[PDB]
Amino acid sequence: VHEFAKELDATNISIDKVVGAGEFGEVCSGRLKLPSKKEISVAIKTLKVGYTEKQRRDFLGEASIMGQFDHPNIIRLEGVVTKSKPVMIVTEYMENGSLDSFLRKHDAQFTVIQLVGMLRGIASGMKYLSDMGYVHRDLAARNILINSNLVCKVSDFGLSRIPIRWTSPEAIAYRKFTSASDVWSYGIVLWEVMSYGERPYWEMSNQDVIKAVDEGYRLPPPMDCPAALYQLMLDCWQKDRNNRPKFEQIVSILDKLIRNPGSLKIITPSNLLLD
Numbered sequence: 001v002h003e004f005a006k007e008l009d010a011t012n013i014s015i016d017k018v019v020g021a022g023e024f025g026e027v028c029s030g031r032l033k034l035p036s037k038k039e040i041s042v043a044i045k046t047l048k049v050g051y052t053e054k055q056r057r058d059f060l061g062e063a064s065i066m067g068q069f070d071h072p073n074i075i076r077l078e079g080v081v082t083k084s085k086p087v088m089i090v091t092e093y094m095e096n097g098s099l100d101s102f103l104r105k106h107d108a109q110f111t112v113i114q115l116v117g118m119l120r121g122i123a124s125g126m127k128y129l130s131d132m133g134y135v136h137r138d139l140a141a142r143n144i145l146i147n148s149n150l151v152c153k154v155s156d157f158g159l160s161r162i163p164i165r166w167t168s169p170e171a172i173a174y175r176k177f178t179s180a181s182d183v184w185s186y187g188i189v190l191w192e193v194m195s196y197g198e199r200p201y202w203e204m205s206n207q208d209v210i211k212a213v214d215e216g217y218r219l220p221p222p223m224d225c226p227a228a229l230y231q232l233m234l235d236c237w238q239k240d241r242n243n244r245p246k247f248e249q250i251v252s253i254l255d256k257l258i259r260n261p262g263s264l265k266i267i268t269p270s271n272l273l274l275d
């Protein structure tokens with residue numbers, strides 16, 4: 001883990017509050033004093049007392065992966081604490097939490113351009129991940145964090161190298177995970193954002209989510225969704241993975257939509273639509 005994660009001195013970390021329950025232990029917020037003496041807000045994941053050696057490996061394994069990525073739209077690893085206990089992973093602080101829970105608090109309260117900004121950040125982060133040869137496999141709005149300035153960053157590197165609702169049909173069918181299956185997931189995230197955090201496929205049985213999508217059914221346009229953005233979803237959800245856009249193309253599409261907000265003016269039987 002120390003190839004990609006710096007070892008932090010525990011004396012430089014202040015823990016202020018527990019803010020969540022993680023897979024391996026509590027998540028806290030606090031402050032980190034940098035070698036320059038600058039103090040920054042951080043999130044702190046702790047490894048629970050009485051951990052097994054395997055838990056320690058899987059815990060720190062995330063830091064090993066996260067530490068390979070230095071990008072504005074990927075959660076920044078500040079470092080780890082391993083030489084003292086509790087074992088910790090320290091990352092940049094994201095004031096507004098998970099993107100899906102954030103948007104649910106704000107239904108219909110953002111502009112389309114604000115939402116497109118969020119989406120462009122996520123796409124940029126994914127473009128870099130895929131450039132680096134990583135397939136995330138768990139790209140979902142719940143695994144995107146959002147800061148005080150609404151900047152969105154990819155998080156949760158525990159499953160990367162299954163979440164049925166976010167997974168492409170071929171990855172469900174025979175574990176064909178590629179950057180193009182991450183693009184499928186991105187289309188689902190795009191739907192989540194434009195739906196202000198609605199659950200994809202609501203509470204449909206997983207068996208029906210699998211069967212419906214395989215038959216060609218797709219999530220319907222979110223309320224007041226621009227046609228450009230719904231078409232982007234449909235493109236991300238092409239049955240043939242070779243026909244899905246690459247993340248670089250997605251970033252380019254969104255940059256155009258940011259540039260000419262007017263374009264967004266054009267707005268878009270069964271719950272799901274047959275394409």
Ligand SMILES: CCOCCCNC(=O)c1c(N)n(-c2ccccc2Cl)c2nc3ccccc3nc12
Pocket residue numbers: 019020021022027029042043044045075089090091092093094095096097098145155156
């Ligand atoms: C409602 C607003 O809450 C914002 C709290 C601050 N959150 C962060 O900055 C987090 C943050 N940077 N991480 C995180 C993500 C990936 C790797 C390491 C960490 Cl510490 C979190 N992992 C979490 C796991 C479970 C629950 C809450 C969590 N919050 C955060």
